[PDB]
Amino acid sequence: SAKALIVYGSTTGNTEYTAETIARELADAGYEVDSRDAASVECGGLFEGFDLVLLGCSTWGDDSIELQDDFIPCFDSLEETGAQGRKVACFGCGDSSWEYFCGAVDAIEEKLKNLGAEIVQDGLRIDGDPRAARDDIVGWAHDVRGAI
Ligand SMILES: Cc1cc2nc3c(=O)[nH]c(=O)nc-3n(C[C@H](O)[C@H](O)[C@H](O)COP(=O)(O)O)c2cc1C
């Protein structure tokens, strides 16, 4: 039960760094971690074979909440990923200047719940430079593991 998948959408590298930091925490704890940029993934059956799935996505949109571009395809086809009964947790980078702070996390969590996933922890929301939030990221990964 030690297979973890991380799929992230990141344009300026912040959610990518966050994914790398989570991946190391899980691997140190004994998980076999498969980290993938959402740009590279196929949506059909994406979660197959994984005991834990972590989804990272930054938030965009001129005057609406939009997901990072590379994440949109598998969000649109999230019902084909194998999320039913899957343990999942979400993370994302954003900027609290925006009212809908890390709103992509809300959109992904709400759809996952409809699709029957088990959300193992409330999503991690990072403001600004994620390197300045490293302790929060490591602690969240620790807490996700402890809620399995
Ligand atoms: C047009 C635009 C819209 C944005 N909208 C939001 C937003 O609604 N909520 C939020 O938290 N951050 C918003 N941001 C901030 C980005 O999510 C932030 O730059 C983040 O660090 C990017 O993460 P990434 O490098 O992983 O893509 C917006 C940024 C831009 C340029």
Residue numbers in the entry: 1 to 148
From the manuscript:
The WT and disulfide engineered Flavodoxin structures were determined to high-resolution of 1.20–1.55 Å with B-factors in the range of 16.15–19.24 Å2. A43 is located in a highly dynamic loop region and the disulfide bond A43C-L74C stabilized the loop region (the local B-factor decreased). For Flavodoxin, smaller fluctuations of the terminal distances suggest that A43C-74C is more stable among four proteins.
Previous studies showed that proper introduction of disulfide bonds could stabilize the flexible region of target proteins and reduce the conformational entropy by locking the protein into single desired conformation. We applied our method on two proteins which were previously determined to high resolution and frequently used as fusion partners for GPCR crystallization, cytochrome b562 (BRIL) and Flavodoxin, and verified our prediction by solving the crystal structures of the wild type (WT) proteins and mutants. The theoretical and experimental results both indicated that with relatively lower values of conformational entropy, proteins would be more stable and readily crystallized to higher diffraction resolution.
